[PDB]
Amino acid sequence: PKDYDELLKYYELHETIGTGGFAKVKLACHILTGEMVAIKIMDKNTLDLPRIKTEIEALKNLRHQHICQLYHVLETANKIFMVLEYCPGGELFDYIISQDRLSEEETRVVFRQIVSAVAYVHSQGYAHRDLKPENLLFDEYHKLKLIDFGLCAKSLAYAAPELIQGKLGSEADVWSMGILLYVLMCGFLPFDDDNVMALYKKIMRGKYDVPKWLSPSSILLLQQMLQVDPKKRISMKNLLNHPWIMQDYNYPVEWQSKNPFIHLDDDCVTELSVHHRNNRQTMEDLISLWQYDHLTATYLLLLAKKARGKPVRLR
């Protein structure tokens, strides 16, 4: 109750919109902007504590069009709150359930965004190591956003044989994306079993069912991504411009950030200094501290307004 006092200053909390084992996420409204945000809540006491320093510091160093944006971090005696970009389209998994499976054309659209995000994550020196439809969300634009960076440093169905054997984090994400590709185009996992060691065994053998509806080029790509030997596996580089990926596009995956923090935004800075009745130069400095506090939150949520073609205005 007193743990939520600091948060409730800045946000109107709505329902729990989801709950994994490690954290609960609530929908909320940022009071100063009216912007919807997802707030991941973690109990420090009943927790795996390294998992959230991993995620927060990863998110501070990752700014990308298909990575879920962090805004505000609040730590209390008993809680850690992470205010994040709200993605109303929900999990990719649920879209794959409602449609039985995606067509090759629709899969490619979706998959190029995943390859974009993961390729960027690798460019910054990280490896996600937990890639699956549950960890990809559709934003308001029906564009994908990658989430849950708790295992990415410098699921077993999606885990690569080397990663389970504990021997190469970049090649393991390629494997996981192979499983993801398969799920998108088939509607089920290529390796699956109710017994965890039997699933393990299937993964090591590398043999899977190849449904009739798949094209020969899809099957080739799956065969290249799901090599048990990571040396034989296709690298991230040649994934970006693979003939299958290029189909209907004819350019490689644009993996670079289209929203890199170059300088600041003057329209956001002015509205803050105007709304708070502060010296403009002083407002430029406190934003530039980048503490991921309520001020950082307000600035970043005003960029979000600009990014969606809306006026940068507080109330």
Ligand X SMILES: COC(=O)c1ccc2c(c1)NC(=O)/C2=C(\Nc1ccc(N(C)C(=O)CN2CCN(C)CC2)cc1)c1ccccc1
By the criterion CB under 5 A, which residues form the site for Cl ion?
Answer: 112, 253-254
Q: Is 130 assigned a catalytic role?
A: yes
Cite the beta strand spans of the chain per DSSP E: 11-19, 24-30, 36-43, 70-75, 79-85, 90-91, 136-138, 144-146
What's the closest the beta carbon of residue 307 comes to Cl ion, in angstroms? 18
Amino acid identity of 139? D
- Could you tell me which residues are beta bridge partners of residue 81? 41, 74
Please enumerate in sequence order all residues whose Cβ is within 8 A of that of 14, keeping only pairs 6 or more positions apart, or say none.
26, 27, 28, 29
Nearer Cβ to ligand X, position 36 or 109? 36
Nearer Cβ to ligand X, position 85 or 171? 85
Amino acid identity of 241? N
| CA atoms of 75 and 82, how far apart (whole Å) | 9
| CA atoms of 315 and 300, how far apart (whole Å) | 16
What's the closest the beta carbon of residue 149 comes to ligand X, in angstroms? 6
| CA atoms of 308 and 312, how far apart (whole Å) | 10
Nearer Cβ to ligand X, position 90 or 125? 90
Partner interacting with residue 129 (select from Cl ion, ligand X, none; CB below 5-8 Å by kind): none
List the x/- string, 236-255, binding to ligand X by CB under 6 A: --------------------
Residue 295 Cα distances to 32, 66, 272, 284, angstroms: 10, 24, 9, 11
Q: Which residue is nearest to ligand X (CB)?
A: 18
**Which of the ranges 106-114, 118-126, 142-150, 174-182 carries the binding residues for ligand X, by CB under 6 A?**
142-150
- Does 24 appear as a known binding residue? yes
Q: Does 187 bind ligand X (CB under 6 A)?
A: no
- Please report where in the chains the tokens 């984090």 appear, as a residue: 169
Nearer Cβ to ligand X, position 19 or 270? 19
| CA atoms of 85 and 102, how far apart (whole Å) | 26
Strand, helix or coil for residue 16: strand
List the x/- string, 25-54, binding to ligand X by CB under 6 A: x-x----------x-x--------------
What's the closest the beta carbon of residue 187 comes to ligand X, in angstroms? 19
Nearer Cβ to ligand X, position 88 or 211? 88
Question: What is the strand order of the sheet 144-146 is part of?
Answer: 90-91, 136-138, 144-146
What's the closest the beta carbon of residue 115 comes to Cl ion, in angstroms? 8
Which residue among 130, 148, 173, 285 is the active-site one? 130
Cα-only R_g, the chain: 21
- Does 22 appear as a known binding residue? yes
- Residue of 52, 84, 110, 117 that binds ligand X (CB under 6 A): 84
| CA atoms of 162 and 173, how far apart (whole Å) | 11
Q: Which residue positions form the known binding site for ATP?
A: 17-25, 40
Residues forming the site for ligand X (CB under 6 A): 17-18, 25, 27, 38, 40, 68, 84-88, 90-91, 137, 147-149
